[PDB]
């Protein structure tokens, strides 16, 4: 079950393209031409995907404390549910971890400076969680 994943860029409303360096570093960049902005969006469940850097060949993941990190081996921490906001922006949340009692989800997100935030600090109603998927077209 490694269904073909479409190659796409993920544009943050914050004004940056998500990117993954070969060493696993994940942040944002205004340079859309950089190959590190290309990701394989791989379907692994009903609107649940894996996000793999094409150049780095590493998966975006989130651990039990909310820290985003890069993983070579695929594990359940590499699974992100895809939801919609304003029927335009897409938000990616952990399928394993969330806030105790409230049930609030944890999301992939970038701050104004184009840097990654801790998953529990990223809110669905905040721009930090909002992304615009831009397929390069296959």
From Swiss-Prot:
GO terms for molecular function: growth factor activity; heparin binding; sodium channel regulator activity; transmembrane transporter binding. GO terms for cellular component: cytoplasm; extracellular space; nucleus; synapse. GO terms for biological process: adult locomotory behavior; cardiac muscle cell action potential involved in contraction; cell-cell signaling; chemical synaptic transmission; heart development; JNK cascade; nervous system development; neurogenesis. The keyword Nucleus applies. Brain, eye and testis; highly expressed in embryonic retina, olfactory epithelium, olfactory bulb, and in a segmental pattern of the body wall; in adult olfactory bulb, less in cerebellum, deep cerebellar nuclei, cortex and multiple midbrain structures. It comes from the Eukaryota. It is found in: Nucleus. Keywords: Disease variant, Epilepsy, Growth factor, Nucleus. Changing residue 47 to A: Gain of function, affects voltage dependence of SCN8A fast inactivation. It is linked to Developmental and epileptic encephalopathy 47: A form of epileptic encephalopathy, a heterogeneous group of severe early-onset epilepsies characterized by refractory seizures, neurodevelopmental impairment, and poor prognosis. Development is normal prior to seizure onset, after which cognitive and motor delays become apparent. Belongs to the heparin-binding growth factors family. Involved in nervous system development and function. Involved in the positive regulation of voltage-gated sodium channel activity. Promotes neuronal excitability by elevating the voltage dependence of neuronal sodium channel SCN8A fast inactivation. Interacts with the C-terminal region of SCN9A. This is Fibroblast growth factor 12. It comes from Homo sapiens (Human).
